[PDB]
Design a protein around this ligand. Structure first.
Ligand SMILES: Nc1nc2c(ncn2[C@H]2C[C@H](O)[C@@H](COP(=O)(O)OP(=O)(O)O)O2)c(=O)[nH]1
Length: 224
């Protein structure tokens, strides 16, 4: 009504880390949030993901964008900061404060071998919606595309440009599932607990654990 803060949640990830599952679970819990899926945008689209992000922050209704793209390379993060900063004046007045929250999907201590074993097996066993591999016809192609994102992966580094522009980093886990607890569900809980602590005015009421579980079950059983 006088000073509003908006949030862009930015993954740092590779294919199969669970971005879509985590973000769908969060959107099930918080319907007012906007999940913008790079998978669903034509590469020949007039409005690209950065444009749709700013449009989805214009109304007083709209506070949060889940920016669903890998951003494995540092240049992909730089693109977000520079484009949103250049264009936000077309959409937002000067009373709107924008915060960028990194969602780090790949732990610093994770080897490339473990990253591959977890994510590749997820994708071949359960499928993925990344535009170029959603079909699974040439399995060799799925491998080649996934290897591209890993070859380009540059870990988050908030000590220098561009990642120093993040206002906050949420560090996720990436694990084989253990004790019947899916890694992505653990990460949904990490995000929720982290926001309650660091941005209390965002989550007005923390959801019940059974609601979190149910919203995650819904995301998990979604098979397009
Ligand atoms: N076993 C297991 N599978 C998971 C978990 N999180 C997501 N998945 C499944 C759902 C998908 O079929 C596949 C890739 O997940 P995704 O959410 O589409 O990843 P992403 O490519 O959007 O980053 O892995 C998880 O925590 N455990």
């Amino acid at each position: 009504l006088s000073t509003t803060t908006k949030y862009i949640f930015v993954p740092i990830a590779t294919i199969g880390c669970g971005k879509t599952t985590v973000f769908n679970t969060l959107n099930n819990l918080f319907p007012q949030w906007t999940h913008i899926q790079n998978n669903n945008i034509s590469k020949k689209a007039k409005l690209k993901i950065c444009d749709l992000t700013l449009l989805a922050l214009e109304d007083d209704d709209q506070s949060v964008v889940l920016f669903d793209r890998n951003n494995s390379a540092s240049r992909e993060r730089r693109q977000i900061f520079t484009t949103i900063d250049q264009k936000r004046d077309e959409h937002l007045d000067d009373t709107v404060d924008l915060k960028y929250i990194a969602i780090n999907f790949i732990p610093e201590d994770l080897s490339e071998e473990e990253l591959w074993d977890i994510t590749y097996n997820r994708v071949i066993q359960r499928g993925d919606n990344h535009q170029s591999i959603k079909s699974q016809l040439d399995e060799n192609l799925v491998e080649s595309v996934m290897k591209g994102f890993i070859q380009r992966y540059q870990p988050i580094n908030t000590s220098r440009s561009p990642d120093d522009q993040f206002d906050h980093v949420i560090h996720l886990k990436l694990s084989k599932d253990e004790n019947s607890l899916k890694s992505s569900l653990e990460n949904v809980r990490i995000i929720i607990d982290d926001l309650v602590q660091n941005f209390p005015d965002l989550i007005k009421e923390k959801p019940a654990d059974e609601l979190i579980n149910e919203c995650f079950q819904k995301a998990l059983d979604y098979k397009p």
